[PDB]
Design a protein around this ligand. Sequence first.
Ligand code: FES
Lengths: 137, 97, 118, 86, 100, 48
Amino acid sequence: TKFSIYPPIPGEESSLRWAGKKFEEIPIAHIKASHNNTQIQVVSASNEPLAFASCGTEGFRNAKKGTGIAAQTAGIAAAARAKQKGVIHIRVVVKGLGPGRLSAMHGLIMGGLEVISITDNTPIPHXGCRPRKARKL
Amino acid sequence: SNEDLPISMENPYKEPLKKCILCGKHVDYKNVQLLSQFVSPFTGCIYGRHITGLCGKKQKEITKAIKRAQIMGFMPVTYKDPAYLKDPKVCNIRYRE
Amino acid sequence: PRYELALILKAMQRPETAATLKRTIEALMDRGAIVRDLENLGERALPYRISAHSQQHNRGGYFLVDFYAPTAAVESMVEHLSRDIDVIRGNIVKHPLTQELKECEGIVPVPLAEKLYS
Amino acid sequence: AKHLKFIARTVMVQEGNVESAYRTLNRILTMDGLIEDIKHRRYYEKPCRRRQRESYERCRRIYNMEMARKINFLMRKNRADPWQGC
Amino acid sequence: NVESFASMLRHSPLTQMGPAKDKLVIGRIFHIVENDLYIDFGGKFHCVCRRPEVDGEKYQKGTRVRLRLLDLELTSRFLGATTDTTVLEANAVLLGIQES
Amino acid sequence: REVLQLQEEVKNFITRENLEARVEAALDSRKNYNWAITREGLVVRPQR
Ligand code: FES
C-alpha cells in the first residue's frame, strides 16, 4: 500500500501497528519550544506522565537555554527516563517556533526513541489577547 | 446599394463566459461535504479564490456557508473532516512531499 | 416568514428523542408557527466538544424543522431552546430555499488597471 | 481545545525520515500562512500599519505577476537571429 | 462589372474561416534557423515552430505542413501601456507534414 | 399557481393530531444534504 502522511483516524480499521500498538496507543512527546527555553514531556496515551526534561533542568542558564544544543540535550534526557519506562515509539507534538523546535526532536531520536508522527500545536488565536506593543530597535 | 457590404449585428462566434465549478448550484451550510473541498486538510484554513477558482459570488457563499456551518455544529474549524479527504480535489494547491 | 431550525439533540434513546421533538414542535405551534416538515439528518459525532447544561457532548442527533412563523416568534423560540436540557445547540435561520438564486452568465474579467487604481 | 487531536497539522514519518517529515510540515504551515501569521502576532500591529502592509503586499503581487507575464510574453522572440547580417 | 473590395473580402478563405483558434491550416516552410521552422499559412504573420523530433530531416524549405492555429497575431496590453505589444508572429502548433 | 401548489402542500404539513406519527416517521428515515463537486462542474452524490 502507498504511504499516507495523513494520520490514521480513530474508530476506523487501519492495518498500521507499532510493536503491536495502534496509533491511538502510542505515547506522546510534548515539546514546548519557546524563544528562551525548551520543555519536553513524554506522556502515555492515557495522559500518564513518564518523563520530563528542559534546558533549565539540564544545567543551562540564561541565553544558553535558548539554543538548539540545549534543547538537544533536554531531548536526550527525556528519552532516557522514558526508555526506562518502556517507550520506543512516540508521537511528537511541538508547540512554538523557538530554537529548540527541531533540535529537541533530534535529541529524542538519539536517545533511542522512534518518531512516528509530527504534530504542530503552536497556539494561534483567531482574533484573542492583544499582544505587547512593537519594539523600537 | 451593395449586397456584399458588411452588416451590423452581434458577434456570432462569441463564446460563452467562463463559469466556476459551482455556478448555478445552491450552496447550503448543511452540505459539509461540498464545503470541506475548499478548506485546508491540515489547518482548516479557507482557501482564497486564487486556489479554489471560484468567482466572487460563490467564494462569498462558500465562506459564509463555512463560517455558519462551523459555529452551528456541522463542520470542524481547525481541520478538514477526515471523512472528506478522498473527495474530488478541485483546488489548485499541492502539499505533500 | 419561512424559517429552518437546525436542531442538535442530546444523544438519547428513541423514546426520549421523540418526546424532545414533540415537545420542541409543540413549542413552535404554541408560538403561532405552522410546521411544514421534520427531517432527520442522523446521529453523528460533533465536529468538536460542546458543553451544554453542565454536561459535555461528543455525539448528537441532527434534526431540521421547516416551519412558518411570525417575526416575533423567533426571539421567543430561541429563548425556549436555551432552557431545554435535551437540546445541545439550536439555531433558527431564514429558510435557504426562500432566497432565489439569480442567474449568472459567467465570470466577467476585471480590468487590471482598476485593481491598482482601487 | 475542543477539537480532536492528532488530525490538524499532523504529518506521519516515513522510513524514519524525520527531517523530510519536518520539512513537509513546515511547508504546510508556511503555505497556509500560519508561520507568517504567528510571526506577525508576536507584537501588536496597529490597524493603520496592517492596512498599509496589506495594501503594499497586494500591489507588489500584482506588479510581480504583471512583470512575469510581460517577460514570458516577450521571451517568445529569444530564438536565434533569423536574419543575421541584416 | 469590376469586382469590388467588399466582394473580395466576403468570399476570401481567411474571412470564411471565422475564428482562427483550433483551425487546421496548411502552411509552407520558407525559412529555417537551426531547429526553428518559419511557416507561412496565408495570414499576415508567419508562425515559428520547432523541428519535430521524429522525421526532423523531412522538414525543409518548401515543405508543406499541417498546423493547428491558435492566434493570427500574438498581442497583449500590459499595465500602464496605451497600446498593445505585438511580437509580430502567429501562434500555431505544428502537427506534421502534408502528403498526397 | 402559487396558491394551488401551496394548497396541496398543506395536506402534508405537520399538525397536532399527526405530530406523533410524523415524529416517529422521521426517526426511521435519513435525509442527506451532502454532495461533492468535480473540476468539470458535475455533482457526485454520496454512496448510499
Ligand atoms: S461563475 Fe456563475 S456563480 Fe460563479
